[PDB]
Amino acid sequence: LRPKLSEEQQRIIAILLDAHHKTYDPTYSDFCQFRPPVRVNDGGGSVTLELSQLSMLPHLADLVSYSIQKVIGFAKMIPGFRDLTSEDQIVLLKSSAIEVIMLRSNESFTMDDMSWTCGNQDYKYRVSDVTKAGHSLELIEPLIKFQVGLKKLNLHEEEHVLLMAICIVSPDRPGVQDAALIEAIQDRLSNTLQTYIRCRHPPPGSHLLYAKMIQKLADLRSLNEEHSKQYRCLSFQPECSMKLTPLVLEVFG
Ligand SMILES: C=C1/C(=C\C=C2/CCC[C@]3(C)[C@@H]([C@H](C)/C=C/[C@@H](O)C4CC4)CC[C@@H]23)C[C@@H](O)C[C@@H]1O
DSSP: OOOOOOHHHHHHHHHHHHHHHHHOOTTOTTGGGSOOOOOOOOTTOOHHHHHHHOTTHHHHHHHHHHHHHHHHHHHHTSTTGGGSOHHHHHHHHHHHHHHHHHHHGGGTEETTTTEEEOSSGGGEEOHHHHHTTTOOHHHHHHHHHHHHHHHHTOOOHHHHHHHHHHHHSOTTSTTOSOHHHHHHHHHHHHHHHHHHHHHHOOSSSTTTHHHHHHHHHHHHHHHHHHHHHHHHHHHTSTTOGGGSOHHHHHHHO
8 A cells, every 4th residue: 555645744844855955055165164174194094193183173073063053953843853852852963963964964975986075176075084084994984885875775855854854853862851752753754754655756666765764774873883982082182172163072072
């Protein structure tokens, strides 16, 4: 059976598409406002050199900080999100921030050369740029694999925004108070996604797509964990806080 999208479900999708269009600039016109990217010579991938310089950290920190602000804006427009207590809203935002950023970044990722291309060459990020920010291949390699796997699903924008919403409204995040409420909200989003796929997504892969999408969420949890481990080590580097931002410090601290 392929039940049609209810009037409410269609409304949820419209609201999410609008939220994304208002919080994701496909032209990346704000990027020149971030601290400039600095790419030092490190063809050997020296951890000692990378940690002593962290030349790309200021730029990527601003990029991520900026993105967290956009994510907060997006999340506030998710139907039902504002019904939660502020305590639960903040817990959900802090816990999923990095995951949603990895998800939304897929829009600028390109399989042409396995990079995130944001306009001009200065704003093209490769594996080597992330290592210059203090992160290791233990995170980067699985991240690139994740980006490629996601690109291959060829998600409709409707599916993409629903996935980010579902990721944020997760009842199994540490410290959530009203898990039942959060679960009701996520279920409404999950059923909307499942219905949209069986109804609007053409074959091949009509079905199976939902399961592959849910598995990506599991993949994100793992990446989240590894990122946290690496952030901790990074915070041990003297004078590192100045290269970040208050928002990044709170969310990842
Ligand atoms: C942001 C974006 C983005 C790309 C994301 C990237 C490429 C550069 C490295 C990064 C930012 C990794 C990186 C592992 C995270 C890095 C943090 O620890 C930060 C240093 C403070 C996560 C997503 C990935 C560009 C646009 O797609 C908008 C989006 O919100």
